[model samples]
Target: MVILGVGYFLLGLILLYYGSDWFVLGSERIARHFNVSNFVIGATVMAIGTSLPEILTSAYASYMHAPGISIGNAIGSCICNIGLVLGLSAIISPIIVDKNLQKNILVYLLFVIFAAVIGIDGFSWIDGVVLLILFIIYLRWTVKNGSAEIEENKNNPSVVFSLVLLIIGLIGVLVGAELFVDGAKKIALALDISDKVIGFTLVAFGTSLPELMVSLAAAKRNLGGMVLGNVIGSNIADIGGALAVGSLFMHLPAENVQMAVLVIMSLLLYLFAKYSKIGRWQGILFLALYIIAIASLRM
Candidate 1:
């Protein structure tokens, strides 16, 4: 049972990341046709693109009546993105932060705090609607203030092809989410573990695979600054989109310790953004904190 569960679980991870990558590629190609600016695309598509996995995973978990997995996956993904992804990336190379990102980070923090407040006593679909509405407003503001310049694309693919890719990618993500939730629930039951613990440790890490891979690759290519934008943007999507989706299905519960750790990580990230850099030492500090956070959960 455990072996079968693990197989389905790993397959789910592969499909989730693979489908998300294809989805983003298709969306980027289509957006370029409309002459969308790079900044806007980066802010919306790339950031939220990486988060499709988390969003879908949480939604499926909630629909399956496992609110623990749904809520834990949403919050855990945020915590992992900042602590594991960013911390590991910085270890590869010091991450540079653009002052522009400070505003975005502040915005992200606002959303996080709002989510925490709503979920403190548990949140309903009504709260989910508010979060989604706020996300739409944020999206609009991002597009408006974003640069108007467009980059030329010589290899423009046909619109039909991009559409097909988008549709196929969406289907893959949907199916993968089903498999992921099923497998995760099975594993949790077989191991006699709480769904929340499984969601926080296993499911969250699994869904964050893309961010980890992207940040590490960027770090290696001396594009470490890009990691900060992705981390901030992805975290926002996880908190806003993923959590809202989970809440829409049922009353989403909260984890005080995880929430506190998330806030602490955000504050630390704010300091890094304020200083315009995250050095090796800071990366180490993030890893240490993450370990301690995990230890606290185990305790």
Candidate 2:
């Protein structure tokens, strides 16, 4: 059983890495060809693309009657996005949030608060309706604010090729998520870890891998705003998108521990926004805090 779990874990990691790469590349190419703004691509296309893992994993967990794991994973991933991913990316290359981007971040933050309120007791189908409505509003705003610059990909290949890659990537992401969740469940049981603990630590961090990779890559390219945007977009999706989808499966019980984490994470995210720039030291601080938070689950 341990060997099987290990094999599944490895398979999931491989698929997640390659699948995210293919999806990001294909999505970027498609967005460029359509002359879509980076903001739009980041908030809508990229957010949704990177969030595929969360959506799949959470939904599957809920279907298996593992709502604690499903709900905890989503919240934990959100915290990681704000603290670990954003902090590390900024440290790699200082991120400066423009006024427009700042406004978007605030809006995303509001959505997080709103989602928290709804999930306080538990989510109902009506809450899903409200979430969907907010999602539409967010989508509308993104399209309006998206870049107007025309994109000319002189070296662009055929659309069919891109679509093929997209399909392959999608398949890989799904398969990888399945394997990951299965292995995680087994490992959690073997370790005598609670579902909530597993969700908050292992599953959350695993699914957040794509965002971390994307942020680091963007930072390396000196696309600081893009890195920031990716983190913000991911946060929005975790609450607005994943939570919305999860609500459809089951009423996500808002445990006290989950709520407490949300508040602490929100405060940390606000600090990051207040600084609006994070250096290596800040990254170290965030990474340390993240490790502590994850370790707390064991207690």
lDDT of each: 0.72, 0.70
lDDT of 2 by residue, 179-225 (tens): 87777777767777666545555656668877776666556666666
lDDT of 1 by residue, 173-256 (tens): 655655776677777788877654555566566677666655565566555545666677777788778888888999887677
Assess candidate 1 and give its TM-score to the true structure.
0.74
What's model 2's lDDT at 112?
73
Worst 10 residues of 2 by lDDT: 147-156
Give the residue spans of candidate 1 off by over 4 A: 1-42, 150-200
How far does residue 93 in candidate 2 sit from its true spot (Å)? 2.4
Q: What TM-score does prediction 2 earn?
A: 0.77
Candidate 2 steric clashes: 1
Q: Which 10-residue window of candidate 1 scores lowest in summed lDDT? A: 147-156
